[model samples]
Target: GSSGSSGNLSASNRALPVLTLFTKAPCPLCDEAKEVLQPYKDRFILQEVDITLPENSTWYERYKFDIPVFHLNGQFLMMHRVNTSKLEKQLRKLSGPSSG
Candidate 1:
């Protein structure tokens, strides 16, 4: 029963690539990025890490000046602006029955 349930659990809840957006509190760019990606929220879980926060600042140093930077599957996709068409294509490519 345990083995059967393990397979079933993995089949039902697949891990999708997270879209990481380095942001800053009150940053307009971050707001814009959020608006642009809102439509595809169901497809990708957009995670915004506030760079201004001490805990997140060091990790996001490369993106401090360019808040709202997008990282998909651990790769930087874009900065300053969110490319809707490119993002949609990337999502399609990354999402599938076998893709994580």
Candidate 2:
């Protein structure tokens, strides 16, 4: 029953890397950062985290002043501002030779 070409989970696209966005509600830079991410939307799976949320208190304390930080596969990628070229380079490494 399990002998298939990874055909069980068709609902999710694993080729795209998960890009975690650490954000705070009031930061203009955080919002602006998203704009840079808009055009390359298909490159990565964006997972936004709002540190200002009460449940995310630990994140709030650690990332309070660094609201616009980004993470790739749960690791540090970039921050403070958007660097499309930098993102593109990382995206290339992730999706490379993995898909058509």
Candidate 3:
């Protein structure tokens, strides 16, 4: 997987989109999501943000009840358990040439 500052990505790495995962520390469901997503990290970039953190209080207020906001292509999508197939399809869409 390629790694660089969030806003700095090479042209060849353009297809690699960002995934924002909202979760809290020590959450079992979060762990499960991580496990499900670990294998596909190379194909996509997953950003885990702890909503319970003080800095993320606003995020917590917005999605705290959900606690697992999954986003691709900067679009808010799924939450809760990792639906691998659904996520895969969404990722495919986000990584597609015609995607924004």
Candidate 4:
């Protein structure tokens, strides 16, 4: 089985794409989603947004009911659940030769 590891990746690995994960504390779905995305951790920078914060009201309202929402490069992607195959396909498309 694949260990889902990003072996020997440099610590300065922030040049890759960014994936924003909107979530709050004590969310089971959010936790599960994080696990599902472990394999792809090296492919993108995972940013967590705590919607529970009052300062993040805008983001909270936009995704309040939809915890575990995902955004790629500041664009909306998926929510509620993590689809590994779909995520991989999308990332592959973005990393393709003509993606830019």
Identify the runs in model 2 with alpha carbons over 4 angstroms from their true place. 1-14, 95-100
Residue-level lDDT tens digits of model 2 in 1-100 = 2232423544545677899888777688888898888866666788888788889878868888766888876777888777989888887676455354
Winning model by TM-score: 4
CA lDDT of each candidate?
0.75, 0.77, 0.76, 0.78
TM agreement with the true structure for every prediction? 0.74, 0.76, 0.76, 0.77
Mind giving the per-residue lDDT tens digits that candidate 3 earns over 1-100?
A: 5463345444544567788888886678888887888767765789988788888898889987786788876777678778888888876566555545
Q: Per-residue lDDT for 6-56 in model 4, tens only?
A: 467444423566899887777888888998887777778999888889999
Best by lDDT: 4
- Cα deviation of 68, candidate 4, in Å: 0.8
Checking candidate 1 for backbone clashes, the offending pairs are none
Candidate 1's TM-score reads: 0.74
Q: Count the backbone clashes (under 3 Å) in each candidate.
A: 0, 0, 0, 0
Cα lDDT tens digits for candidate 1, 1-100? 1222212234345466788878776678788888898776655778877788878768568777776788888778778889988888887676556555
What lDDT is obtained when candidate 1 is compared to the true structure?
A: 0.75
Displacement of the residue 34 alpha carbon in candidate 2, Å? 0.4
After superposing candidate 4 on the true structure, give the runs of residues whose Cα lies further than 4 Å from its correct spot. Answer: 1-14, 95-100
User: Positional deviation of 52 in candidate 3, in angstroms?
Assistant: 1.6
